[PDB]
Design an enzyme around this catalytic site. Sequence first.
Site, PDB file in Angstrom:
ATOM      1  N   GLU A  28      49.920  34.008  43.359  1.00 53.11           N
ATOM      2  CA  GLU A  28      48.587  33.496  43.072  1.00 53.11           C
ATOM      3  C   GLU A  28      48.682  32.397  42.022  1.00 53.11           C
ATOM      4  O   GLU A  28      49.730  32.169  41.416  1.00 53.11           O
ATOM      5  CB  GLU A  28      47.650  34.612  42.596  1.00 53.11           C
ATOM      6  N   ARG A  29      47.560  31.712  41.812  1.00 52.12           N
ATOM      7  CA  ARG A  29      47.539  30.552  40.934  1.00 52.12           C
ATOM      8  C   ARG A  29      47.900  30.941  39.507  1.00 52.12           C
ATOM      9  O   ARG A  29      47.510  32.005  39.018  1.00 52.12           O
ATOM     10  CB  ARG A  29      46.158  29.899  40.952  1.00 52.12           C
ATOM     11  N   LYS A  67      34.963  39.220  40.844  1.00 55.10           N
ATOM     12  CA  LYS A  67      36.082  40.128  41.084  1.00 55.10           C
ATOM     13  C   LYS A  67      36.836  40.448  39.800  1.00 55.10           C
ATOM     14  O   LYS A  67      37.184  41.610  39.539  1.00 55.10           O
ATOM     15  CB  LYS A  67      37.018  39.495  42.113  1.00 55.10           C
TER      16      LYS A  67
HETATM   17  N1  LIG Z   1      28.944  42.724  35.393  1.00 54.55           N
HETATM   18  C1  LIG Z   1      28.494  41.485  35.230  1.00 54.55           C
HETATM   19  N2  LIG Z   1      27.435  41.281  34.417  1.00 54.55           N
HETATM   20  C2  LIG Z   1      26.985  40.032  34.254  1.00 54.55           C
HETATM   21  N3  LIG Z   1      27.431  38.902  34.791  1.00 54.55           N
HETATM   22  C3  LIG Z   1      28.477  39.138  35.595  1.00 54.55           C
HETATM   23  C4  LIG Z   1      29.052  40.360  35.862  1.00 54.55           C
HETATM   24  N4  LIG Z   1      30.112  40.214  36.739  1.00 54.55           N
HETATM   25  C5  LIG Z   1      30.158  38.928  36.981  1.00 54.55           C
HETATM   26  N5  LIG Z   1      29.188  38.221  36.322  1.00 54.55           N
HETATM   27  C6  LIG Z   1      28.965  36.784  36.368  1.00 54.55           C
HETATM   28  O1  LIG Z   1      29.618  36.287  37.514  1.00 54.55           O
HETATM   29  C7  LIG Z   1      30.512  35.218  37.130  1.00 54.55           C
HETATM   30  C8  LIG Z   1      31.656  35.170  38.107  1.00 54.55           C
HETATM   31  O2  LIG Z   1      32.715  34.365  37.549  1.00 54.55           O
HETATM   32  P1  LIG Z   1      34.219  34.901  37.700  1.00 54.55           P
HETATM   33  O3  LIG Z   1      34.306  36.306  37.205  1.00 54.55           O
HETATM   34  O4  LIG Z   1      35.162  33.902  37.118  1.00 54.55           O
HETATM   35  O5  LIG Z   1      34.434  34.916  39.280  1.00 54.55           O
HETATM   36  P2  LIG Z   1      35.886  35.218  39.853  1.00 54.55           P
HETATM   37  O6  LIG Z   1      36.397  36.100  38.775  1.00 54.55           O
HETATM   38  O7  LIG Z   1      35.772  35.908  41.181  1.00 54.55           O
HETATM   39  O8  LIG Z   1      36.609  33.910  39.915  1.00 54.55           O
HETATM   40  C9  LIG Z   1      30.882  35.583  35.689  1.00 54.55           C
HETATM   41  O9  LIG Z   1      31.406  34.481  34.963  1.00 54.55           O
HETATM   42  C10 LIG Z   1      29.530  36.050  35.154  1.00 54.55           C
HETATM   43  O10 LIG Z   1      28.725  34.937  34.844  1.00 54.55           O
END
Ligand SMILES: Nc1ncnc2c1ncn2[C@@H]1O[C@H](COP(=O)(O)OP(=O)(O)O)[C@@H](O)[C@H]1O
Lengths: 173, 510, 85, 460, 458
Positions: free
Chosen positions: D182-183, D156
């Site tokens: 939020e956190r 997200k």
């Molecule tokens: N567009 C993208 N391209 C490549 N990897 C992605 C992309 N979007 C998300 N990811 C992967 O998904 C993971 C989800 O982690 P994170 O963004 O922290 O989840 P959230 O933000 O929902 O907590 C990222 O750290 C990355 O490894």
Amino acid sequence: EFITVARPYAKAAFDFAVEHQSVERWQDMLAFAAEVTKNEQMAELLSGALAPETLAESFIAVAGEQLDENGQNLIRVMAENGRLNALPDVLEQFIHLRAVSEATAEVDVISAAALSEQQLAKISAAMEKRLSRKVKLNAKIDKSVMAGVIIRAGDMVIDGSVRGRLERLADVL
Amino acid sequence: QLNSTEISELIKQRIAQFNVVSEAHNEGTIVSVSDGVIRIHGLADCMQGEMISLPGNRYAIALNLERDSVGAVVMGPYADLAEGMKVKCTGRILEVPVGRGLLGRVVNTLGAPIDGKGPLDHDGFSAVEAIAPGVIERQSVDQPVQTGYKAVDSMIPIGRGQRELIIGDRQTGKTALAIDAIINQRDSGIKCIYVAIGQKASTISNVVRKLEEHGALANTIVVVATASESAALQYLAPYAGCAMGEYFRDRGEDALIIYDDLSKQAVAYRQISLLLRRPPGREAFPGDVFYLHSRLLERAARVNAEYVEAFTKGEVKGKTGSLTALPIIETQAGDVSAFVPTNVISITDGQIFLETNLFNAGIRPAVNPGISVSRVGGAAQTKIMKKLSGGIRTALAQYRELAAFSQFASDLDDATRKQLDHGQKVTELLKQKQYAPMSVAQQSLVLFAAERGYLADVELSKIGSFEAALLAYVDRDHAPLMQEINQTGGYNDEIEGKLKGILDSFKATQ
Amino acid sequence: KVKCTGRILEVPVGRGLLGRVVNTLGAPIDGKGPLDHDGFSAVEAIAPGVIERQSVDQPVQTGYKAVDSMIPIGRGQRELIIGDR
Amino acid sequence: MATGKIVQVIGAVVDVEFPQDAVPRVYDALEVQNGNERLVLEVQQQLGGGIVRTIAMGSSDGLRRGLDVKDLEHPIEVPVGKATLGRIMNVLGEPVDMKGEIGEEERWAIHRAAPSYEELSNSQELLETGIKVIDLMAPFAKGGKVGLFGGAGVGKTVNMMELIRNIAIEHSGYSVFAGVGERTREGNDFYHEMTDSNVIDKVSLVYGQMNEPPGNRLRVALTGLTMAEKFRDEGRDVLLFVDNIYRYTLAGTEVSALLGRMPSAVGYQPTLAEEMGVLQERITSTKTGSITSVQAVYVPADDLTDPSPATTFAHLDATVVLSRQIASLGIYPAVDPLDSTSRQLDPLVVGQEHYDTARGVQSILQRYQELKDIIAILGMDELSEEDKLVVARARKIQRFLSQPFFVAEVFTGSPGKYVSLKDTIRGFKGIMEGEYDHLPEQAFYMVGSIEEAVEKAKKL
Amino acid sequence: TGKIVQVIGAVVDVEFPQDAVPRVYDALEVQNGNERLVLEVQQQLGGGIVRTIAMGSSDGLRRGLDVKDLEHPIEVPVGKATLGRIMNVLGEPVDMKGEIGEEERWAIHRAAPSYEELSNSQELLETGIKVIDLMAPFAKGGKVGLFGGAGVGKTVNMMELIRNIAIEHSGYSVFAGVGERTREGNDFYHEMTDSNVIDKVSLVYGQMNEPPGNRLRVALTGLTMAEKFRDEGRDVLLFVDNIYRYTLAGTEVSALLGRMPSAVGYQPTLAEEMGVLQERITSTKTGSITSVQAVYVPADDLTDPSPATTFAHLDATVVLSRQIASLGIYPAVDPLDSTSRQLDPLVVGQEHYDTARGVQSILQRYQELKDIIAILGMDELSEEDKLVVARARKIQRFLSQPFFVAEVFTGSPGKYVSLKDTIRGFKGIMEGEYDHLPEQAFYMVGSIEEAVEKAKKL
Ligand SMILES: Nc1ncnc2c1ncn2[C@@H]1O[C@H](COP(=O)(O)OP(=O)(O)O)[C@@H](O)[C@H]1O
Ligand SMILES: Nc1ncnc2c1ncn2[C@@H]1O[C@H](COP(=O)(O)OP(=O)(O)OP(=O)(O)O)[C@@H](O)[C@H]1O
Ligand SMILES: Nc1ncnc2c1ncn2[C@@H]1O[C@H](COP(=O)(O)OP(=O)(O)O)[C@@H](O)[C@H]1O
Ligand SMILES: [Mg+2]
Ligand SMILES: [Mg+2]
């Protein structure tokens, strides 16, 4: 207990008494009404379900020594709201309000025996420096103090009694 | 022991002279302000329901005349108000401006124009709160109100004076069907009113310019109380729309009023009622929420000519007026066993229920048979439409339940292969596109060439093009009666023969 | 004006009540004339104490196969009959 | 000159008494010296006799009765404009960031009426976000509302960062991010991930987190919105992110309970549907500019009928669902194309070609969803010769939806791509109608326009 | 004599001299603008204050208006004079005809008949409706109640009962419309006037546009006319078109009268407010009242306090349901919930009793199988369970019937079915002599000999 219902009426009575330069008369008028509120028969009438208007008239009658402005209006307004039993407190609040504007404090002193009138005048002059008011001391002869004095200035208290120091020592142990 | 809004300086004013009634009974002072509810002291002359005028240009509605103070609600932004503001009582029960000069305007719930086109050419004022005509003043609704939709003009007919609930889940074509029913009245002498309650302003502006595109706006009044506005405006808006339509009703004319969401008028009234500390009932709604909608919808009525004569002081002798209501209700997750949906089903006459499953499957409008009904029934229809479409909604009530029960296979194929291909093609031909209204002639020929065979064997599933060619053939060459069968509504054997002839004449060229 | 009787709701009682239809104050309502009661008894009373009881070991028969065989009732028992409408 | 006196303190609710004529108005801000720190009170009710009931924008501990209160003659006012870009602020417009001070030229009150009826734009327009899945299956109306429903780990944050980037570089707007309830950990690592991606220079942040008194969590969203409105007045297109609107509703419920109002349908406040509309009605397109909004939504107990979701869904124009299954497939962004929804997929709004392209893609994918289950129990070779082809085209459509983001280079290395709407329409028409059948499914994965897919197949 | 001191919606507070305070059901009069408004006093507070409910629109009332103390309760015209006419809740004529020619007027608040004065009758009353008089037969002088949600058929049924008994019946009749549509009251009035039966039906209306007081007291003012016709020694029919609106109009007012709310919002006095009315509508040794009451159930919840507390006051309860109506099976009676006091072998005969109980038993057995049919399909059922399923569905179809009043919703002609024919048909279905027909042969037919004919045409 109805401090909270008496606050508005006391404030209105006082704030009116200074528009008409008669605080001193209003105080005794309210004192008369506060005494009539205590009688055993009148306290029976005030409890009954009379109409506010006729119940107010049955209260005006027993006090003719009242202004048009004071009795015949304040008692009626309090009767419409059914507040007449609050009169003993509407008095005290009024007194209190006065002492505030007149920059006065009713400091109370307690002792095991009478003070020398040099001690007491020093107390007066010293409290008037502790506070920022003209104090009006009144003493009490309470034997349990045994020695020294308690000075109560409202919610502030200074305890110099030997019993207080004794029972403080008892908890130092 | 609690105070009762008696305070130091008001007590002082009573101390100065007890009979302050020697002052004007015409005015008072605001004493408290909370969440749009206001408490006023004074106003000995106030009467319940009265408009109280505030500083600026604002009004409050006196709801409570208590022992010493008036409780009211503010019809507008209330945060600008403060204690001690002087307040004056206009001696008028709540009244909105009304007249035929309002047609084509967009107005606030107080009849203040909201478009940029200047003041109103209103006729007079009329009370927002009224009691509907009595039982002896009514008349039986027996005239058709035409919507563009082949599905509802057949299964769920509407009649001038009737009250049709449009109930369904979110995003199922409720406002589409309502504003299309408005658009279809563009050229049929029946005025329109659209009152939007709690709608977000983008939607209202879009539907306003959509009404303007199709030329309908010159015939309709738009009353708007958007989602941002005070709860009192949202709760009183439909009564203003009803008071505007009741003018045409009482002049012996016809009007059709659409309340875009009664399920949000109910929420605004619940907010007002809970801020006034009233004990709530089921689903936290107030006890009198039914009486909120009834005394509203009971004003959509058809009145006999003697009432129009007695009202207009003789001037309109011998015409009967009517006001047709179509309230919209949104139900959570498709259940109708809920308090407010069931309260409104218990007030309106008919019931068009739009189902989300059908809507997703492409069947639009998603008129669910078996649940939807018209309590006025065939009395509302032109006799041609009445005869062609006899009992089909109850036919589909069982077609659906049987196609749901007999899921494993088409067993006991006595005629189910004909039954459940007829009932499939009927559903497929009821499908329609919005902003495409079909006149009663186009609906009638199409229904006849579906309902007694002629298309129960040919599952061609190319129906849209077939019908678009049929309606074009009959317009260009084959029928001038398309301006006769749509002038009368007649059902003769002599016209049935001509209909069969044109039917086969077109058929032999597809 | 209201006067306070020092009394507590009492009700007629006796064998003459047997076979009558009576309202909660003891008055006949069947129209068959007055009661042949045996004095009066207080409506609100105290139950017998622990040491005054005795164990329930006598049957009271319902005449129903379903109850008398599997849900017996004894003389001195309290049996709730609970269900829907 | 201070003129009021504190008369009560009960939790976060403070009553102060003023002269009978000087009573503050409803949303005015007062302030008090709570020891050394100043404390701001937002008025909520005017009671009789000059008493005014307010809620503290801070810790209530340490307040005596009788303290002097100063009446500011205006509501809470916050800085606005360019000066706020790249900073972090709390509700009161004070830098909780430590980069010093905000050199704002102007300050705006957080409370005001929504645009008037004659002021809205008499037009309807799409927002080209540059992301294939969103632009195809769930287009954005310029000035609409969008819900984000995914959980955690689904990426997200990277979606929000890609939107913040594209709205600034390709369009010429700014962005406001209001994190309500939020956190704090997530806001810290979000700020760090945004500064490690050079997007911090283009977004203005406002935070009221879970550790904040109720009033902060209530009014932070209005602070963010009133900054977005100052960007709108300048003639720009703005993006406003609300990190959890459900917490705005829940803080309104807490404040309502503190004020002592009767509980509504499910215990929510009686003013729920009006408190929500007063926020969501300011997020509209205007004939000077527009604010589009992306709002993370949380559904209590997975109940889409609960009054909070039921009230929120009335305002949203689009709905994007993020699924962990799509991420386990290594497809990013992990947008679920079957449940993702927009009410701009109306053939008269977006056109017939786009509408039918989206519908075809959806039908293909929801057929593949069942052919996959048949394969899982009967094996591949049970499918007829026609199904074996729809599977082959589904597995390619399912991969052409992935995209490289300018901000995701730290993961995939790919330069990142911005895809125009008509180009993704072309590409999906192609894949769907059998053209481009003659290249492997891996030639579509993590690529931009379909010409780059054919060229990757060449290199492959 | 007195003055208004408060106005809260429908309730008004009036102050009188303490030597002249009215009694607790007297009427009072106020000049509201130019009209005349009647208040009925509900409570005596202290100080000479009195709380009243306004029998009219409350808007326009100032506090401080003078009110006039009528020293008698609300009184309505009664007797022969009130037959072919429509009346207000206040007993005023509401049709445009002249004044009512009554010689006598009765107070609408009256005591129920004594216990030794009641009478009970086993005389079965026949209706042309299969399901009603098979499953829930009712007797001359008993109470019938139609329970249902909204849109399920309560009014179309009450009108069929009116047609099937109230026309071929000698004595007078009374119809009280308590909080229902004015459209339906006008339709009923014109149907009666165009059938020349209006000379026997006395009407009262408190329809749903009226303020709470009219809807509150209209049922009592209709019951008073029914009682007057009863005391003359006649036997009367009483149709109450929605009794729920009598309790609802109390709830709306209950909170304003200063009474703490009870279980789901209702007033504390719900069961007493209901019993004080339901208990005076009864037959006696001088005359009998046969009554049909529609009973709305909110949100289809049969356990809501009002239906639950109403169930006890009726002899025959016919429970309509939305699930059956959605199948198009009108009348949508639920046979596993309708019951009657008269469905005993010593009252209705052994054959009728056994037929009704067999129908109940196999419909209940089908209910018990529905849940497994939903999961596994109908192919897992035992060979004899498929038979009870098929016979249950055929019974469910044969319970449907076309109505003479529903002849405008559908086109089918109305059918009148005698009790002999309906038991003859259900006894035939249950024992399998019609196992060979399809289900659709039983949908919307009269006697079984019409189902055997419909089977030929498919
Ligand atoms: N567009 C993208 N391209 C490549 N990897 C992605 C992309 N979007 C998300 N990811 C992967 O998904 C993971 C989800 O982690 P994170 O963004 O922290 O989840 P959230 O933000 O929902 O907590 C990222 O750290 C990355 O490894
Ligand atoms: N007959 C139809 N055929 C195709 N599309 C339709 C039809 N009717 C409506 N729609 C489409 O459905 C969409 C939603 O319809 P609409 O907005 O009228 O529903 P609604 O009841 O107003 O929902 P809500 O008011 O809760 O947003 C519209 O964009 C419209 O284009
Ligand atoms: N026998 C029937 N045939 C057809 N429709 C019926 C029949 N019985 C009831 N209905 C339906 O009942 C609908 C609701 O009207 P009504 O029964 O008066 O409702 P309510 O029970 O709320 O008074 C009618 O519009 C009608 O379609
Ligand atoms: Mg809509
Ligand atoms: Mg009815």
